[PDB]
């Protein structure tokens, strides 16, 4: 039920609707920017993912679904960077309607926001189905733990 791709992999969701706290540039070159809108599931290529500019705990990847939608799950991947794999091992999920106010996701009846189990390599998919689904227009992925660098490729599930 529900559990459908919301538009990241198939590019249904436009680039302008995907932003982040910051992003990385290989060799400091603007052309080699690991843009937030590259964080699409199964994205192929050489700069095929979002990588934060810095590795801090306050980085985030924001997705503007364009409208209020039912969000039931999420899927993430890391990505390779030359001779190095990079991926987010753990993360939190926040959501809202206006993209300025956020609600940290948390399992039903629980203190402290949920820290989701993430990836363990560069291409394997990690899917998490929310115990309690929610409705929102904006969703943010907040990496908590990472391997080498904060790097993501995402797909949001719902209907």
Swiss-Prot record:
Residues 2-159 form the F5/8 type C domain. Milk and spermatozoan. Also present in epididymis, kidney, heart, lymphatic gland and spleen but not esophagus, small intestine, muscle and liver. The two O-linked glycans consist of Gal, GlcNAc and Fuc, with probably Fuc as reducing terminal sugar. Disulfide bonds join 2-159. It is found in: Membrane; Secreted; Cytoplasmic vesicle, Secretory vesicle, Acrosome membrane. Contributes to phagocytic removal of apoptotic cells in many tissues. Plays an important role in the maintenance of intestinal epithelial homeostasis and the promotion of mucosal healing. Promotes VEGF-dependent neovascularization. Specific ligand for the alpha-v/beta-3 and alpha-v/beta-5 receptors. Also binds to phosphatidylserine-enriched cell surfaces in a receptor-independent manner. Zona pellucida-binding protein which may play a role in gamete interaction. The F5/8 type C 2 domain mediates high-affinity binding to phosphatidylserine-containing membranes. This is Lactadherin.
């Amino acid at each position: 039920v529900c559990t459908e791709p919301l538009g990241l992999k198939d590019n249904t969701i436009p680039n302008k609707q995907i932003t982040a706290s910051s992003y990385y540039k290989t060799w400091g070159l603007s052309a080699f920017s690991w843009f937030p809108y590259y964080a699409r599931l199964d994205n192929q290529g050489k700069f095929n993912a979002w990588t934060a500019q810095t590795n801090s705990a306050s980085e985030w990847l924001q997705i503007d679904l364009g409208s209020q939608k039912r969000v039931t799950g999420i899927i993430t991947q890391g990505a390779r960077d030359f001779g190095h794999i990079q991926y987010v091992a753990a993360y939190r999920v926040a959501y809202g309607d206006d993209g300025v106010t956020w609600t940290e996701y948390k399992d039903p009846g629980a203190s402290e926001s949920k820290i989701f189990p993430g990836n363990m390599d560069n291409n394997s998919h990690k899917k998490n189905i929310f115990e309690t689904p929610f409705q929102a227009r904006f969703v943010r992925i907040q990496p908590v733990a990472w391997h080498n660098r904060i790097t993501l490729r995402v797909e949001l599930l719902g209907c």
